[PDB]
Amino acid sequence: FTSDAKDKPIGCSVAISTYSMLGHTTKRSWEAERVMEWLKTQEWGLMILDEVHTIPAKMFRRVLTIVQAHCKLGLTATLVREDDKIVDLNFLIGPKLYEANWMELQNNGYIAKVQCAEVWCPMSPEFYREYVAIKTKKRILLYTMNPNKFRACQFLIKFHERRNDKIIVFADNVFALKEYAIRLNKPYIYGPTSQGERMQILQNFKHNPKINTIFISKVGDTSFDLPEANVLIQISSHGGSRRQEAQRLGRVLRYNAFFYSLVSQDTQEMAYSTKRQRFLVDQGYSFKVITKLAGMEEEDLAFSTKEEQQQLLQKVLAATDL
Amino acid sequence: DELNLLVIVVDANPIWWGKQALKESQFTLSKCIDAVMVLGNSHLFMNRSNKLAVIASHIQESRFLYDGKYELLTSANEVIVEEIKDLMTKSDIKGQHTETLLAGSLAKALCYIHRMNKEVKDNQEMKSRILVIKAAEDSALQYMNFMNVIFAAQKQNILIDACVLDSDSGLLQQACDITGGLYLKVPQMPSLLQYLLWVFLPDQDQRSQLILPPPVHVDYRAACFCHRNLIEIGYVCSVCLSIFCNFSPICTTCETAF
Amino acid sequence: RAVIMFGVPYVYTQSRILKARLEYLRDQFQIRENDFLTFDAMRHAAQCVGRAIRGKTDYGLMVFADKRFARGDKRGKLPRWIQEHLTDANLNLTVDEGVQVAKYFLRQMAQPFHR
Amino acid sequence: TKRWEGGYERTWEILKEDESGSLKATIEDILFKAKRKRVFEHHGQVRLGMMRHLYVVVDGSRTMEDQDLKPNRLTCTLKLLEYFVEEYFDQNPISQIGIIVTKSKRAEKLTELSGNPRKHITSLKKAVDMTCHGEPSLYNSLSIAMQTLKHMPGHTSREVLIIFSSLTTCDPSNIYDLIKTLKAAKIRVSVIGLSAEVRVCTVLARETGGTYHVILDESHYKELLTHHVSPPPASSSSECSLIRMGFPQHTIASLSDQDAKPSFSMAHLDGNTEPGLTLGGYFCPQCRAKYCELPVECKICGLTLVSAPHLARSYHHLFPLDAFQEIPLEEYNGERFCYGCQGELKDQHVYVCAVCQNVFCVDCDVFVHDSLHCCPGCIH
Amino acid sequence: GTSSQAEAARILAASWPQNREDEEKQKLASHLFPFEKL
Amino acid sequence: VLFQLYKDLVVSQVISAEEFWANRLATSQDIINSFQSIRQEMEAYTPKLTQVLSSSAASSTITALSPGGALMQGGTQQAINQMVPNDIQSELKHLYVAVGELLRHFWSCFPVNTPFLEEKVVKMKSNLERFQVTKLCPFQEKIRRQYLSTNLVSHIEEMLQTAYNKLHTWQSRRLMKKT
DNA sequence: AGGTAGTCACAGCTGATTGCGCTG
Ligand SMILES: [Zn+2]
Ligand SMILES: [Zn+2]
Ligand SMILES: [Zn+2]
Ligand SMILES: [Zn+2]
Ligand SMILES: [Zn+2]
């Protein structure tokens, strides 16, 4: 029941639907209205809720009260959430029944032993002056588009491609991702692209040796059908979302694998990375700090000279969204 | 954190030392025991963490042997002397067995090393080596047990060093070659202590730096199942790999499997 | 192991025999001509492509080498035992990705199974 | 009903107190129970074997250039074949390996059937830089293998391993007749596919008694090769299966003695460069021919030169050590010192050998059953 | 430019965490990442 | 090499041309007395300090263990990689190949189970003797002229002696079987 | 001198429009 095929949800044993449709505050479709009328007139056994962390929302809390069910099962991987609304979930659904021990789970070998890395890249002098000069939300693109971080990401991509490792590169702030992906000439998911293009890109990402690295912009921040991957390189994530970091880590486990987080020194991204890993260290993960990348000068990387680095300031300051 | 264990196996066969005393040579069992004790004292001198064990190989059984001098060394030497006296004085020849039980002594040494390794704290690794001084002739009846002991020592990475006095032993050569130990034949018996201090005293890490005599010509003659004698060419079964000196229509060992 | 359909099999509209039946169904049963032609084409395609699966242990590869198959009005005419196995991922994929999908399927179908 | 829909398990009910502090006794029991996690056998499978004359057939068609296994199928196949040859010669003392490469509808005998591992590894390294062209011919490879193995003695198990990358094979004649001939010759054929299942390979493996498998990834390929390493079970007793082989002692020459006689190695004589004229090595017990590597069959008199420790390493399987009788410490009215390590017996259980009735602790019992494979008391 | 490459490499490779770690090295595998072991 | 081998065996009358290509195509109670004596001697035993080692013994041991000593021999084929020049080494390799082929033929003939092989083994022994007289004796003379310290010919002599002893033993067995 | 509702970025969903293809 998602208003795409309408596979006769009336008279069904197991019904599968989604949020943001059972709690509409606007006019509903005639077929959808009839389906909701049928669905709100009988008891339900074991209403399974997926991604239970985003239950305490303005429109998602009423979904539980808009239907009648006997047992409410909540399943999630990252129960952490800001605004301290997780406590409300204790009475919204019930108590926390099971909490998997991730360390002993990866000890049994059924969960990939991911080697977490927190590698920072120094801010170039041509970028740090603009970073410290402006403060009205215009500094996000400055530490995101750090040339040193760009070189580090390119080096990591090339090194893990030389050993045939599937790489998923998460990158919020899609404006930066646009010039980040076309420079490397690699596929990327802008996010409002289509339904078919994303499906075909994710389908040819796994069973193809020619292409083994993709870029995602906040789209993979939920539970999808992404194939098995070994390397995750996140750049410019959200502010302090422990949920987002835990979800991104969960896309790797399935040292079999390793995931990297790239941050810019002497910027707010340092504090963001520090405060967004406290969930994973509670889970038992240790984030090794990588300051130097071996063989950085061994091969050629982008932004080798200062001319293009200082030219990058012009385009990164060209947003001017005022 | 480098703990070195030196288990010294002394061939205490009464018949060979009795013949040596009859020869009235300059070398006797007393001088050999003194050299072994001095080598053990030097090994304990080299480091605090070093551990020492002395096993006497005798016909009846194997005996664990272990005023201005070091206090611990004094007690160790007194214990060694008391144990060797108790072994030799109470050694009564009861039977026609004359070959020394070298294989049993090596098995006991391996068991003692295994016991010591567990008691070693996890912050330290106990490197273990076994030094054997050979006096009597080699024993062929113990071929299978000796080979099993060699393989067990190789599995746990335990060096086996042989210091042959009079007659060469092929089993000791094979043990030294397989386990990576040093095989040496002493030309002048009174110089046994100097040979031990010069060659077998350093550890394997120290043996890498020091220049040492090259390995001797190790033989690999096999033991016939029905004769237990050294052979050059023999018949070997394809199923059980048992070795026979002569062709047989029906393998004896394969009889077990019906 | 593989059944390949080179284009949607459409009956010959000539000879003035099919068109008479189309007109009769149009003016008698209110049957759309396009709907009936698509139904016949997909019925023949499914009938000739479903003969590669005879028995539980039997397996086979089914491809449709025409972009017209990708449209919903023709996929909906396929039998239900083929619809759920035709995921939306492979509806317009090129030849290379079709070959890759075939390789993965054949490799994963050679392993032993149970009863 | 369901197992998990009944009563929730309370695993912590095991521990109990009677004197307020017996938890130390419980954890001592738990620590004792933690040990003895094995069945006192390192392998626990096939305790014997038989002389195997294995022929390995490698595809050399254009399909080997595919990049399913990085970098290509040929390189990964040859690396895993080197590993397989090493492990197979490690676990089979008197076995022989032959390598056949099929290319352009013909089969080339890359290496003769022998027991030298170094020659096979060198041949594989040389074949790493081969040219992948044409199509494979299973018929020709099987014909060559059958022609070579027809004259081998019956007691040896004749096996053929085929690495079939290409899905198409060209046969100059009917292949099912060749399969029937192989079945009549009691030659076991095993095939490891790379792309997908081929009917002819399945029929061949089923009829000849072998196994046919298809690779999922490199790890699965290595697992299949490792499974092929293990020897097959051997019948009780067939006939007078024996073999004349020598045991060349490694007699090196020292100039301190007057009998220091340098000699060229027969194996090194065939090399382009200067052969190693070392002081000594392995001299043949029959014709005094000199060889450096073992086990290598003698080129002159045909005697098989093997190493006695290699044959003796498997002797513990023939005579496994019987498990010692577990006895509680209180019920043992004897000495309280272990016979192996001389340590004081303070464990609740003491193990006594059935033969010599000696005393062994838990650690010494585990060491004897797992590694030593002999009772120290029984040796005396 | 020839000098531009050297200047950019000097600035980038040794900005904050190298002017002191290298000094300590001058005055003085399981947990190593794969690119740090090559 | 094969052409050189053919000339050295056929032209030099070592073997005939027909045969060349044919193959190509303890004591008494005194021991108890000694045991009792050593037991009594070691019953009163004390550790010693001076008698354990002496300066002369230590010096002799160091001399033996120093490079160039008995155990630490320093010579040990100093420059055999360059001694006896490779021109002779090529000839020695050719002789080794010829001896190996002839002995391979001999050991393939063995064991003799038919009367036909008896003449074949005699002809093989005659060929071996002719090859020895033709090549090894001039080789030994050349070595003596150059005074090479290496006993290169010794291995070939050992192999020939082993083959001759085996053939003589087999002939002796054959004679005894007919008695 | 301190704190909460707009606000921006980026994503999701569903509810309609609206624009290109549609047979041998
Ligand atoms: Zn025998
Ligand atoms: Zn047998
Ligand atoms: Zn030989
Ligand atoms: Zn013990
Ligand atoms: Zn016993």
Tab-separated table of N, CA and C and ligand atoms in Angstrom, chain D residues 283-291 297-305, chain F residues 107, ligand 3:
chain	number	residue	atom	x	y	z
D	283	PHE	N	73.034	-38.501	-2.044
D	283	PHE	CA	73.606	-39.509	-2.925
D	283	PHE	C	72.674	-40.711	-2.984
D	284	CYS	N	72.415	-41.193	-4.191
D	284	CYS	CA	71.511	-42.324	-4.362
D	284	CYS	C	72.102	-43.567	-3.709
D	285	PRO	N	71.342	-44.277	-2.871
D	285	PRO	CA	71.887	-45.484	-2.231
D	285	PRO	C	72.191	-46.612	-3.203
D	286	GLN	N	71.650	-46.578	-4.420
D	286	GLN	CA	71.825	-47.663	-5.378
D	286	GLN	C	72.944	-47.400	-6.380
D	287	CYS	N	72.987	-46.205	-6.972
D	287	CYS	CA	73.966	-45.891	-8.007
D	287	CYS	C	74.834	-44.689	-7.660
D	288	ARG	N	74.717	-44.156	-6.444
D	288	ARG	CA	75.544	-43.043	-5.969
D	288	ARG	C	75.389	-41.796	-6.836
D	289	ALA	N	74.234	-41.640	-7.475
D	289	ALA	CA	73.930	-40.397	-8.168
D	289	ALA	C	73.617	-39.304	-7.155
D	290	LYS	N	73.996	-38.073	-7.482
D	290	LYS	CA	73.866	-36.949	-6.564
D	290	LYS	C	72.654	-36.104	-6.931
D	291	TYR	N	71.832	-35.795	-5.929
D	291	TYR	CA	70.685	-34.917	-6.094
D	291	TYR	C	70.645	-33.936	-4.933
D	297	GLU	N	62.647	-38.690	-7.777
D	297	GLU	CA	62.965	-40.020	-8.273
D	297	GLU	C	64.272	-39.992	-9.056
D	298	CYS	N	65.106	-41.008	-8.839
D	298	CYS	CA	66.430	-41.031	-9.449
D	298	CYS	C	66.330	-41.162	-10.963
D	299	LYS	N	67.077	-40.313	-11.672
D	299	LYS	CA	67.022	-40.313	-13.129
D	299	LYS	C	67.737	-41.517	-13.726
D	300	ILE	N	68.751	-42.040	-13.039
D	300	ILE	CA	69.596	-43.075	-13.630
D	300	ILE	C	68.991	-44.458	-13.424
D	301	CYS	N	68.849	-44.881	-12.172
D	301	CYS	CA	68.391	-46.232	-11.874
D	301	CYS	C	66.890	-46.320	-11.637
D	302	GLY	N	66.178	-45.196	-11.650
D	302	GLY	CA	64.743	-45.205	-11.466
D	302	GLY	C	64.275	-45.381	-10.040
D	303	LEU	N	65.186	-45.417	-9.072
D	303	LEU	CA	64.794	-45.565	-7.679
D	303	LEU	C	64.143	-44.285	-7.172
D	304	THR	N	63.125	-44.441	-6.331
D	304	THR	CA	62.428	-43.297	-5.751
D	304	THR	C	63.152	-42.874	-4.478
D	305	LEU	N	63.685	-41.656	-4.471
D	305	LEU	CA	64.391	-41.131	-3.311
D	305	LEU	C	63.430	-40.293	-2.475
F	107	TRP	N	71.054	-49.872	-15.658
F	107	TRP	CA	70.059	-50.126	-14.623
F	107	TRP	C	68.686	-50.416	-15.216
H	3	ZN	ZN	70.046	-44.050	-8.495
